[PDB]
């Protein structure tokens, strides 16, 4: 898979695999297996997890 876009300014834009929309500054969480980034609501995260908790996306959690 590929969820990073190199834009016309030379920057990287991350796309949430849950909704196929970019990071827009709202809270995101990064998968500690595959390194994709998801918007919190797209993965049911409703409050910040403990800092020491690893988070795994739906794809990786079943692997």
């Amino acid at each position: 898979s590929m969820y990073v876009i190199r834009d016309e300014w030379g920057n990287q834009i991350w796309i949430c695999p849950g909704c196929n929309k970019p990071d827009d500054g709202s809270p995101m969480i990064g998968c500690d297996d595959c390194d994709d980034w998801y918007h919190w609501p797209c993965v049911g995260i409703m409050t910040a997890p403990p800092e020491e908790m690893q988070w795994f996306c739906p794809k990786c959690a079943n692997k």
Binding site: D23, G25, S26, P27, M28, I29, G30, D32, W37, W40, A48, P49, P50, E51, M53, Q54, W55
Partner: peptide, 7 residues
């Protein structure tokens, strides 16, 4: 977990 946010 690793999180990010920007106003």
């Amino acid at each position: 977990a690793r999180t990010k946010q920007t106003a």
